[PDB]
Amino acid sequence: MLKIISANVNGIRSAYKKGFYEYIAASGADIVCVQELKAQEADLSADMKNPHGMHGHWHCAEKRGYSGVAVYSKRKPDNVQIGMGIEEFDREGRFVRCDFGRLSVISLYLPSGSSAEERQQVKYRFLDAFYPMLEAMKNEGRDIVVCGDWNIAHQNIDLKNWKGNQKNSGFLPEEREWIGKVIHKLGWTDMWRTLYPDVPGYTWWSNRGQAYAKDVGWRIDYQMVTPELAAKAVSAHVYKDEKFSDHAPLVVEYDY
DNA sequence: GCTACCATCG
DNA sequence: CGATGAGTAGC
Numbered sequence: 469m470l471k472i473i474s475a476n477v478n479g480i481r482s483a484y485k486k487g488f489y490e491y492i493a494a495s496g497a498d499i500v501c502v503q504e505l506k507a508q509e510a511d512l513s514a515d516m517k518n519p520h521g522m523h524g525h526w527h528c529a530e531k532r533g534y535s536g537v538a539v540y541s542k543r544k545p546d547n548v549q550i551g552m553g554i555e556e557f558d559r560e561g562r563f564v565r566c567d568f569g570r571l572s573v574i575s576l577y578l579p580s581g582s583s584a585e586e587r588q589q590v591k592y593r594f595l596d597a598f599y600p601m602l603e604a605m606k607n608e609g610r611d612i613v614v615c616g617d618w619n620i621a622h623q624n625i626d627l628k629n630w631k632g633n634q635k636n637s638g639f640l641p642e643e644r645e646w647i648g649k650v651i652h653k654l655g656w657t658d659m660w661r662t663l664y665p666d667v668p669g670y671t672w673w674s675n676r677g678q679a680y681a682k683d684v685g686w687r688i689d690y691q692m693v694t695p696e697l698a699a700k701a702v703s704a705h706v707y708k709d710e711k712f713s714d715h716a717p718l719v720v721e722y723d724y
Numbered sequence: 725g726c727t728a729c730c731a732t733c734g
Numbered sequence: 735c736g737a738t739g740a741g742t743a744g745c
Contacts, residue, residue, distance in 0.1 A: 478729090479743045504729090506743060533744035534728075580729055587728085619729095629731070632735085636730055675741040677731045684731065714729090714742075 469702075470724040472573065473497040474615035474689055476672075476715035479506035479533075480516055488712040492519045495707075495719065498542050501575035501615035504713075505536030505561070527551055527561040536561040537575040537616070543568055554597055556590075571697075571724075572605075576616030581637035588637055591619070595646050599654075602692075606654050611697040614656075617672075617715065618690050622647045622658065625668055627686040638688060650692065657698035659691040659720055669706055672715050680714075689718050700724060 473495055477483035480502065492500055500522075505512070508528045517524045519540055525548045526538035539545075545566035551558035562577040578598075581588030605612050620643045624630040633639045650656050660669045670685025679685070693701065704720040 482743060504743090511744095531727095531745090582730070583728055632732095633730065638730085674730055676739085679731060682731090686730095 470499075470571075470722040471495070471497045471719065472499045472501070472613060472615065472691065472722070473717050473719045474501045474503075474575075474691055475717035476503040476577070476617045476689060476713060478504050478713035478715060480504075480512065480536075480538075481507055483712040484513075484516060486712045487710055489515060489519060491707075491710065491712065491717070492522070492540065495717075497719070499566075499573050500540040501537070501564075501573060502540070503535075503537045503562075503575060503577035503617045503715075505538060506533050507536060508532060525550070525564055525566060527558070527564045529561040530559050534560070535577060537564050537577050539564050539566045539573060539575045541566060541568070541573070552598070552601060557594055557597065570610050572608075572610060572612045574612070574614045574616070576614055576618070578617060578619045580619050591637070592642075595643075599646070599649070602650055602654055602656065606656065606694065610694070612694045613659075613697065614690070614692040615718075616690070617688060618647070618692075619688050620644065620647050621686050621688055622651075622661070625666070626688075627670070628668075628684040638686065655695060657693045657695065659693045659698060659701055660687070660704055660718070662698060663701055663704050663720075669704075669718075670716075671706055671718055675714060680711075689715060691718060691720050697722060697724075 671689035
């Protein structure tokens with residue numbers, strides 16, 4: 469079985485302090501995509517780059533303690549791509565791609581827009597620039613999984629408070645419609661939603677109020693999968709036995 | 725301190 | 735509903 473895990477660690481050093489390093493191994497995952505390193509290459513221990521002897525490739529932000537993504541894998545990728553190809557976004561380390569034969573896995577951290585209008589601007593530009601990348605990827609004819617924090621919930625079932633967030637970044641009409649475009653127009657599969665029609669599967673909870681304990685959550689972490697591979701997915705779960713981050717790791721198993 | 729990332733209340 | 739009011743990681 470091919471087990472792929474996507475986890476926004478909200479700072480990899482912190483997450484390692486909260487037992488994520490042991491989780492990497494215990495999970496028995498073949499590939500682990502992570503977002504929000506909140507660290508630069510110089511700030512990472514070897515175990516944060518090649519955990520348990522896994523291969524690892526990362527893209528770090530230019531500003532310190534900020535963003536960054538990585539892909540860890542037991543198997544050696546025969547090819548690796550660092551960044552999307554657009555300076556504006558690559559400055560923040562939000563895209564890594566690893567190839568393994570006909571399979572490719574991407575670790576993606578899509579910009580949040582809840583901080584300032586400018587950031588929502590950046591996010592929209594990101595959507596514009598990324599859509600065609602997804603189109604081309606879809607057009608390669610290979611098995612591609614885009615793991616990561618898309619920072620966008622699709623439908624009402626994807627977050628507890630859906631009515632009151634229709635005006636907040638993450639659930640704006642244009643965002644939802646963009647995700648819908650990625651799915652129904654481009655043909656990508658939202659693996660969780662397809663595997664489990666009625667299961668909300670929240671993957672994030674705000675630090676405000678008692679959101680976590682109350683399970684007032686959002687499903688903004690995805691594995692977006694190409695058709696042939698999507699058809700092979702057998703199960704998935706959101707790991708909550710331990711809390712490494714404000715996000716929970718999303719685990720999918722594929723009968724490859 | 726600073727920066728960057730919507731649940732709850734009236 | 736609009737108005738109000740935050741906890742966290744890393745600097």
